[PDB]
Amino acid sequence: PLQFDKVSQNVFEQVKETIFFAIDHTLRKEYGEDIGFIDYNPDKLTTIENASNYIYLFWVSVFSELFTCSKIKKNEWKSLPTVLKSKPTNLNDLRTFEQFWETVLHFLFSKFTNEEKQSLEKQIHEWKTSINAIST
């Protein structure tokens, strides 16, 4: 209702940063020096659409391995629904957004360090509570 937008952008912009971190880290670890050679430039990982396209392009080589214990297939990243690609304008969309990316960030962190994984849990908790602390 009234209180909605500050926590809308707050989750959205943090989810974005976390997706970008996860994609950056995984690509740099696979390819190292050769990241310009395989067309990953950190600028421009500016949109969720860019990130999705990266998961799509590097699916067979890098990302499907991270998704082994998921039902998510390659085609899911070809074109995400807009609810998943943009800032939530309602509570339903915000829960849908946060829930999808929570599950996904888990797989994208699945080979990170125990530390980075704890850091993700901490961030997820803050997202949920800031969301779950809105009923009308």
Query: Which residue range is the domain that position 70 belongs to?
Result: 1-136
**Which approach determined this entry?**
X-ray
CA-to-CA distance for 4 and 136, rounded, in angstroms?
Answer: 10
HEC string of 6-70 equals: HHHHHHHHHHHHHHHHHHHHHHHHHHHHHHCCCCCCCCCCCCHHHHHHHHHHCHHHHHHHHCCCC
Q: Which of 29, 18, 11 is nearest to 111 (CA)?
A: 29
What are phi and psi for residue 88, nearest 5 degrees?
-60, 130
CA-to-CA distance for 44 and 73, rounded, in angstroms?
Answer: 24
What are 120's two structure tokens?
Answer: 């993700």
What are phi and psi for residue 38, nearest 5 degrees?
-100, 25
Number of structural domains in the chain: 1
